[PDB]
């Protein structure tokens, strides 16, 4: 019965394969090849941002355009005024391996990860004055890549054992517990509704899922190695992904096949990071020859390269507005770019 | 203004708690500990605690002598490895007494040459003794293997072969390879891994003097 | 929370007291405090500042060189020492908290002060009784005699409520938003120089006396105050 099941599986393959192929009329180099190309881009550094102690794992931006949370690998936490270079707060951790940050919504809550296999999360508003910890969730077997509130209670959590998990923060527990993947788990993205969520799982394989079901919905792939970093175009209907051969590429899901393969012959250097502007026309992306990057979304051309940093770039990320664009590296500096 | 003004007092303040915390971040010694010897390291981190005295990451924190150690003890390793850019020494453990030697040298092979651990140091301690000896009073040969000289000799023309054997695989080197024979005696095992260090950081700081 | 003060009584000309705050409950050694007055029968008036980190102390003209301020942080006690007394510094002292980073809402906690006894921008208040009658909306003004708003977006100003026989608690803080433990039918706004707070579906025990502050830069000056009646 085995190996009749692994035919009809042969048989499903063939079929997706065959429904895929029968999707593709009109390929994107032939219509976006017309529209009127960016030219040259390039910003200068605004405010620098000194003060941490080593390297720099995550950062975040709030929802008013104007605070920062960052996260670094000397056990520190410090938010940011990103107008008058000033220092709002500074939390200190228990685990000093810390990978991953979040800033909630509501910008009440803080959270934060690493290899201890447990998420934190932080009470930013008190009335005896200081920030402390309100919630320890604990029940993964390997450590944490990435976390990304919803509302002020409910979070959810990926980890390299190839799990993803859904917590209810107040009463603590798993409401919902995604599997089916094979390797590790790196980034997930969610989405501008809030409804569903996507996730590149290092295996050249990434997976869209529903929250409020608890199934698997659908499977991409295209790569030759591991995925990295993975973002959402701001519609809901589209995403991004770059992996560790130094290649990157975009996804559409009623298309359900990729569309541009941004690359070029003289990169041969991994991706870190990923990130989108406001409507849709630059994607951002940092490396590990120590530059970001600058891409037109719709070309896979060159616009830019915000040069500067003395070691690889690990995050960057945008503002709610458009303004301006933070990035941060390994040489312990984080700057704004306007 | 009159109230955007104590907010830089605040910042300054918050300055001046990370800036005396540098000092003391870099005055540290990271060691990371590795081997497939579970009872050799469990005796070592004993006698360790003995001398100072006078799951996940597990943590063990000492002071030698007025300098502060840190040791952390913790398939695709190679994304967990990206933490341990700021070491100073890897200490990798193996039963001499066994086989599973080819295994131990594969895996040797695999951890040295990695690009993260382009400034680290190796420190090798190759353990029981005791067994070795008694079973090579009673000699059982070796096997297929080059051994050129003296194939079921005393302990001092199989040691020599031993850490020959494992000296190489460095592809690049940089740095020298310490060695150790274990022994019962704690102070002689506390003052080797006080001893490699100290080289280790005498030989960064002559390349800003041009040796 | 608990600011519990000590040091009133009963002086003769000349003499000396030292007046003394003790704070439990919060974090002391990251706030910044206020010494406040009140005549026995007159409006507010501002006192002394001592912030964070024992740097920067504010005085006031009226008593300058002659009162100091001081801090304990281990033992969380505030201390303000007086000398060469007049008959003129009867008075009721309030010990106040505050906050400076961004988003932060000065003024919030307030303690019961002590009695004393011995044998420049400028703001005014319209009135001083005003009867209304429960279900009536009802709205309360006050002037002054400069611009408050400034460049950084800001408009620097308090309302401040106290009802009979209590110590007061902050309404509206920044002349447009609201503080905590208050309920949500009290809104304020006004122009330049000209500002009204508005009360809607007013109920008991909001009778008592209104302040308006401001707070643009050193010193801080206080008004009347609008009684209300029911």
């Known amino acids: 019965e085995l190996d009749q099941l692994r035919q009809e599986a042969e048989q499903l393959k063939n079929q997706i394969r065959d429904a895929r192929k029968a999707c593709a009329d009109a390929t994107l180099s032939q219509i976006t090849n017309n529209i009127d190309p960016v030219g040259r881009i390039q910003m200068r550094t605004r405010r620098t941002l000194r003060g941490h102690l080593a390297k720099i794992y995550a950062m975040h931006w709030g929802t008013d355009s104007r605070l920062l949370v960052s996260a670094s690998q000397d056990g520190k936490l410090i938010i940011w005024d990103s107008y008058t270079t000033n220092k709002v707060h500074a939390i200190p951790l228990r685990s000093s391996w810390v990978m991953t940050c979040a800033y909630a919504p509501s910008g009440n809550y803080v959270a934060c990860g690493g290899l201890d296999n447990i998420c934190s999360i932080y009470n930013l508003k008190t009335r005896e004055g200081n920030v402390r910890v309100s919630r320890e969730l604990a029940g993964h077997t390997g450590y944490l890549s990435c976390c990304r509130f919803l509302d002020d209670n409910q979070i959810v959590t990926s980890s390299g054992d190839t799990t993803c998990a859904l917590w209810d923060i107040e009463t603590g527990q798993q409401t919902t517990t995604f599997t089916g993947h094979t390797g590790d788990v790196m980034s997930l993205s969610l989405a501008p509704d809030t409804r569903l969520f996507v996730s590149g799982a290092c295996d050249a394989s990434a997976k869209l899922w529903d929250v409020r079901e608890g199934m698997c919905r659908q499977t991409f792939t295209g790569h030759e190695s591991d995925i990295n970093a993975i973002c959402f175009f701001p519609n809901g209907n589209a995403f991004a992904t770059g992996s560790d051969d130094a290649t990157c590429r975009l996804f559409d899901l009623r298309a359900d096949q990729e569309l541009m393969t941004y690359s070029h012959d003289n990169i041969i250097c991994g991706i870190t990071s990923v990130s989108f502007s406001k409507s849709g026309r630059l994607l951002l992306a940092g490396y590990d020859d120590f530059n970001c990057n600058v891409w037109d979304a719709l070309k896979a051309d060159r616009a830019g390269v915000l040069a500067g940093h003395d070691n690889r770039v690990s995050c960057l990320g945008v503002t709610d507005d458009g303004m301006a664009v933070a990035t941060g590296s390994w040489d312990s500096f984080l700057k704004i770019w306007n | 203004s009159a109230e955007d003004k104590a907010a830089v007092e605040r910042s300054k303040m918050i300055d001046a708690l990370l800036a005396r915390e540098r000092r003391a971040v870099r005055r540290l010694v990271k060691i990371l500990l590795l081997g497939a010897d579970n009872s050799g390291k469990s005796t070592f981190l004993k006698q360790m605690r003995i001398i100072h005295v006078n799951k996940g990451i597990v943590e063990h924190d000492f002071v030698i002598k007025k300098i502060p150690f840190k040791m952390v003890d913790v398939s695709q390793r190679q994304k967990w490895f990206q933490c341990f850019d700021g070491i100073t020494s890897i200490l990798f453990m193996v039963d001499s007494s066994d086989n599973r030697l080819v295994e131990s040298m594969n895996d040797f092979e695999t951890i040295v040459n990695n690009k993260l651990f382009f400034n680290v140091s190796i420190i090798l301690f190759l353990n029981k003794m005791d067994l070795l000896v008694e079973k090579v009073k009673t000699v059982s040969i070796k096997k297929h293997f080059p051994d050129f000289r003296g194939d079921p000799h005393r302990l001092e023309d199989v040691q020599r072969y031993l850490v020959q054997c494992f000296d190489r695989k460095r592809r690049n080197r940089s740095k020298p390879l310490f060695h150790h024979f274990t022994t019962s005696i704690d102070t002689e095992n506390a003052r080797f891994i006080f001893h490699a260090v100290k080289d280790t950081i005498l030989q960064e700081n002559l390349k800003d003097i041009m040796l | 929370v608990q600011l519990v003060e000590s040091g009133g009584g009963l002086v003769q000309p000349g003499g000396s007291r030292k007046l003394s705050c003790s704070a439990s409950?919060?974090?002391?050694?990251?706030?910044?405090m206020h010494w406040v007055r009140q005549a026995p029968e007159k409006g507010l008036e501002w006192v002394a500042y001592?912030?964070?980190?024992?740097?920067?102390?504010y005085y006031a003209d009226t008593v300058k060189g002659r009162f100091t301020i001081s801090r304990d942080d281990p033992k969380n006690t505030l201390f303000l020492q007086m000398t060469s007394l007049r008959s003129e510094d009867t008075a009721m002292y309030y010990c106040?908290?505050?906050?400076?980073?961004?988003?932060?809402?000065?003024?919030?906690?307030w303690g019961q002060g002590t009695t004393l006894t011995v044998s420049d921008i400028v703001m005014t208040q319209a009135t001083s009784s005003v009867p209304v009658t429960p279900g009536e909306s009802v709205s309360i003004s006050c002037r002054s005699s400069?611009?408050?708003?400034?460049?950084?977006?800001?408009?620097?100003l308090y309302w401040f409520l106290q009802r009979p026989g209590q110590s007061p608690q902050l309404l509206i803080y920044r002349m447009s938003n609201l503080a905590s433990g208050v309920p949500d039918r009290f809104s304020g706004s006004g122009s330049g120089t000209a500002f009204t707070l508005t009360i809607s579906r007013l109920e008991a025990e909001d009778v008592g006396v209104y302040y308006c502050?401001?707070?643009?830069?050193?010193?801080?000056?206080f008004g009347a105050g609008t009684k209300l009646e029911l």
């Open positions: 001592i912030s964070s980190g024992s740097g920067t102390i």
């Open positions: 400069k611009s408050l708003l400034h460049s950084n977006g800001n408009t620097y």
């Open positions: 409950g919060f974090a002391f050694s990251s706030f910044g």
């Open positions: 502050m401001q707070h643009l830069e050193y010193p801080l000056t």
């Open positions: 106040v908290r505050s906050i400076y980073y961004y988003g932060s809402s000065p003024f919030d906690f």
